[PDB]
Design a binder for these strands. Structure first.
Lengths: 121, 121
RNA sequence: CGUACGCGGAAUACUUCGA
RNA sequence: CGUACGCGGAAUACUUCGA
């Protein structure tokens, strides 16, 4: 059981729920997918999002600079390792990548990209 | 001679200039690298940037939604193609990717990521 | 700054198979 | 929504070679 950088559990819909949603509505999916990779390990999350202020606040809390650093530090070594944050929403994907030594900046760019991605008209 | 999505020419420093800059100063490079890829074709640019308002204004003009769409449309076909914008600055890289059908949104996210990247403390 | 290459990881696009 | 795979492209990290 590795330590995840996420503070909220995964919310992936079952194949059935996904199908039901499809027949009900795309630019209106159940949510978005985001991931954090440290070296050879990747952690993923699908989170429900409905474009409301309440929902945006909730999902922006899925990870923080501190939770990412704590999870990432477990994989640090003599040499620098590759770190990456990815988020996909409505057909568009943004990936922020860099070496572990720039993790702080990586997280700053990651959270900003996340907010902009979710607040896309 | 293919049509580039860029409106400013490349400014890659020679090996000599780069070396001279190194001995003079990293979080203070001569500039940043950005690229636009449409299908199997990629266009690249290294642009000088000194963190000033004047410089930021200048480099944000290297491409627009219109110049990207005109360059990208040359590669459109029956099926959708993969499009990508990448920018690297001070050890951090941001890549915005998606299918050609989302190019408009891709460009919106790309320009925002570019501005945030260049205005990183 | 740039060139060629290898490994790992990742992203996107198209296609297909499986629930 | 998810799984496995192939091709192309791309990104990052480490290493090395070449200017």
């Amino acid at each position: 059981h590795m330590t995840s950088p996420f503070k909220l559990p995964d919310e992936s819909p079952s194949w059935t729920e996904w199908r039901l949603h499809n027949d009900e509505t795309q630019d209106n999916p159940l949510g978005f997918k985001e991931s954090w990779g440290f070296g050879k390990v990747v952690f993923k999350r699908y989170l429900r999002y409905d474009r409301t202020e309440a929902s945006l606040h909730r999902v922006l809390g899925s990870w923080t600079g501190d939770s990412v650093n704590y999870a990432a530090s477990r994989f640090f070594g003599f040499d620098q390792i590759g770190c990456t944050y990815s988020i996909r929403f409505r057909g568009v994907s943004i990936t922020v990548s860099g070496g572990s030594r720039t993790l702080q900046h990586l997280c700053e760019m990651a959270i900003r990209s996340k907010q902009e991605m979710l607040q896309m008209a």
